[PDB]
Design a protein around this nucleic acid. Structure first.
Ligand SMILES: [K+]
Ligand SMILES: [Mg+2]
Lengths: 215, 225
RNA sequence: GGACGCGACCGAAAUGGUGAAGGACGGGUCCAGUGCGAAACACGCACUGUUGAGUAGAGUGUGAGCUCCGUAACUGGUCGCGUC
């Protein structure tokens, strides 16, 4: 049996100054051969804790690790701005080695509603037989948001893709683009293109739309 | 002082082969266990393989066993991951890492390379088409206007985007690419600007896709009525 | 009575051979674990093990002690005989 490291939670929101705890639970005894790592977007992981509870040289002491049987915890006693990142536990008691799923630690702030924008496809793109319609949800929090596409008031499904930005380094919000992809023929068979947004900072759903072949 | 540089990454067809290298500096690999760990985009760390000092014993994750071979050339102070019979799901950033000294840091991996991207796909290298996302012939959402560029149908990752050759950075959001069903990537970069300057301020997106010798600049303007 | 002498029997340090004992005789025997050597395995060292664990072999110890069968120094004992 390969050893499982079950990591929870997969994400958490916290304010600067808060005490947070992240947990890895081993499927069998791993002694104390557990390490903890920090990873920021686009960057290699950095070692924080080794042997379950030893602080790695140069790591600030607000980081601590603890072992309770086969359960392991990384605690940060008081988060600082630079501590927002993803954390991974690792067992190296035996091979194969196992990493935990990770825990994204994100910063908490006041609910912010998104600003919504819709973009019709360019005539340029239209020359090639594909129409891309784009909807932008700008600078909102929390991350949960619902985007729905309507074409002549018919609800679209399976023909869109979303993408979300990393939480912003200044205002701590998210942005989201959703893209509806149609063949040029389908696109030209309809008039009203709409993007409907549902977010916590919105009292009611907001719809941004345009009519094909207008302004 | 201590550093690790992986190289050799790139695009390869399914069933193909690729050798990665991990150049150490600041220490000698002969006294350390060396490891390879990978990260599929958006996913977590997955341990791939390792090689033990003095015995040369090697270990492998089941998911790559039989296909991948780790090795070491002490005279170049470099380690290697020979990947054969590659599948799309081996697509990942590949990191080599040093397991540190037992007395100093148990079995923690104290140093990691910056990583090298391996894309396994039958799609072939292609530059993006870059389309304008023109600001609305209206006024406002929030008080401002939004414009951007759609960077569509390139392969493989990555691409870079900037605005006004780097001068415009505020209010910029460059989205992580999605892999479309065609097997090509697509992303968009947007920026919010004031609507009072739309006719007089200039906005150009700069898109560079190095694997296809594609570099483009696109002026994004309001069009008509 | 004792001195000297001879002999026998007993004792006996030592010693040749023998064969039972398994962790309460040990080991550089074997196994698991922990730490250390730039060292997870392999290699070396150290520590730890409550049926660690087969009594002569998973041993290429002419091991210690002991069982049994001998040999035996003797500068120990006893008895007989000789002389005084
Ligand atoms: K023995
Ligand atoms: Mg050993």
């Amino acid at each position: 049996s390969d050893i499982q490291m079950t990591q929870s939670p997969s994400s958490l929101s916290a304010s600067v100054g808060d005490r947070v705890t992240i947990t890895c639970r081993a499927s069998q005894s791993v002694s104390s051969a557990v390490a903890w790592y920090q990873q920021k977007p686009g960057k290699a992981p950095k070692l924080l804790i080794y042997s379950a509870s030893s602080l790695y040289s140069g790591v600030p002491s607000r980081f601590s690790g603890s072992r309770s049987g086969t359960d392991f915890t990384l605690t940060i006693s008081s988060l600082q701005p630079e501590d927002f990142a993803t954390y991974y536990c690792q067992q190296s008691y035996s091979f194969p080695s196992t990493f935990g799923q990770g825990t994204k630690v994100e910063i908490k702030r006041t609910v912010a509603a998104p600003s919504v924008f819709i973009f019709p496809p360019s005539d340029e793109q239209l020359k090639s037989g594909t129409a891309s319609v784009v909807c932008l949800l700008n600078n909102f929090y929390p991350r949960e948001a619902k985007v729905q596409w309507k074409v002549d008031n018919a609800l679209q499904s399976g023909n869109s893709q979303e993408s979300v930005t990393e939480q912003d380094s200044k205002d701590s919000t998210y942005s989201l683009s959703s893209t509806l992809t149609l063949s040029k023929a389908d696109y030209e068979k309809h008039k009203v293109y709409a993007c409907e947004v549902t977010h916590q900072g919105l009292s009611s759903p907001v719809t941004k739309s345009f009519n094909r072949g207008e302004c | 002082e201590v550093q690790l540089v992986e190289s050799g990454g790139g695009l390869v067809q399914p069933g193909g082969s690729l050798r990665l290298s991990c150049a150490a500096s600041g220490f000698y690999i002969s006294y350390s266990s060396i490891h390879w760990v990978r990260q599929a985009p958006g996913k977590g760390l997955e341990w791939v393989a390792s090689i033990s000092p003095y015995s040369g014993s090697t270990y492998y994750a089941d998911s790559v066993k039989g296909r991948f071979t780790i090795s070491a050339d002490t005279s170049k102070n470099t380690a290697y991951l020979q990947m054969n019979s590659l599948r799309a799901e081996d697509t990942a950033v590949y990191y080599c890492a040093r397991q540190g000294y037992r007395r100093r840091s148990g079995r923690g991996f104290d140093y990691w390379g910056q990583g090298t991207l391996v894309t396994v796909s039958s799609a072939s290298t292609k530059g993006p088409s870059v389309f304008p996302l023109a600001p609305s012939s209206k006024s406002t959402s929030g008080g401002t206007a939004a414009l951007g560029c759609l960077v569509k149908d390139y392969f493989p990752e990555p691409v870079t985007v900037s605005w006004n050759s780097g001068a415009l950075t505020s209010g910029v959001h460059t989205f992580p690419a999605v892999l479309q069903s065609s097997g090509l990537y697509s992303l968009s970069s947007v920026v919010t600007v004031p609507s009072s300057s739309l006719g007089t301020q200039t906005y150009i997106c700069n898109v560079n896709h190095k694997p296809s010798n594609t570099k483009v600049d696109k002026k994004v303007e309001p069009k008509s009525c």
